[PDB]
Design a protein around this ligand. Structure first.
Ligand SMILES: Nc1nc2c(ncn2[C@@H]2O[C@H](COP(=O)(O)OP(=O)(O)NP(=O)(O)O)[C@@H](O)[C@H]2O)c(=O)[nH]1
Ligand SMILES: COc1cccc(-c2ccc(Nc3ccc(C[NH+](C)C)cc3)cc2)c1
Ligand SMILES: [Mg+2]
Length: 170
């Protein structure tokens, strides 16, 4: 034993869905109200999940990004993916399929650890129904979690569930 197990997590999804808010809420217990678009940021947190101490290495991605070769590099290194949309933005939900395809393509695999995340569940302007999202997740064979970076609902659960998925995969 040389140190706690390490997991490489990538947070992906359309611009504005709250990928950064979720990550910052996890790491710093802080909600960011301001919208500062991200290019690429890396974070690290030690947690205990199901009695195993482990180290989450988290890559926060950009939503607004085209073809890049830098992009495909970290999808190759990443062991698990949080695919985030916002429950008040139907476009970000439809984009989920595109994110999953990019991942499946680069990892050259049908069975990649993933979790579907419906963020901003605190907002009253919901446009994507929970049942719809559960059905999408059921069809992909992956878990679905509703989160709010603001209230903190589901945040820990989302990351911990992803880790549990990576564990099952090996
Ligand atoms: N009400 C509410 N607002 C949220 C939530 N998550 C993020 N936001 C808000 O939505 C905006 C976008 O959040 P942000 O984390 O920057 O989104 P992002 O996916 O990281 N954007 P980008 O892809 O450009 O980096 C911020 O103003 C933030 O306050 C949430 O769960 N609830
Ligand atoms: C290539 O694809 C990946 C994919 C996903 C995550 C990672 C990853 C994330 C964070 C770290 N670690 C890290 C290093 C420095 C700091 C900054 N320190 C001040 C804490 C934070 C995290 C390392 C790798 C790499
Ligand atoms: Mg971001």
């Amino acid at each position: 034993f040389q140190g706690m197990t390490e997991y490489k997590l990538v947070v992906v999804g359309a611009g504005g869905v709250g990928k950064s808010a979720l990550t910052i809420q996890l790491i710093q217990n802080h909600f960011v109200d301001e919208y500062d678009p991200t290019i690429e940021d890396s974070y690290r947190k030690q947690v205990v999940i199901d009695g195993e101490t482990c180290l989450l290495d988290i890559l926060d991605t950009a939503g607004h990004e085209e073809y890049s070769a830098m992009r495909d590099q970290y999808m190759r290194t990443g062991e698990g993916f949080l695919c985030v949309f916002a429950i008040n933005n139907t476009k970000s939900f439809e984009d989920i399929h595109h994110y999953r395809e990019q991942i499946k393509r680069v990892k050259d695999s049908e069975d990649v650890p993933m979790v579907l995340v419906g963020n901003k569940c605190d907002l009253p302007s919901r446009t994507v129904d929970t049942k719809q999202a559960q059905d999408l997740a059921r069809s992909y064979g992956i878990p679905f979690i509703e989160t709010s970076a603001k209230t903190r609902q589901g945040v820990d659960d989302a990351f911990y569930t992803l880790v549990r998925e990576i564990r099952k995969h090996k």
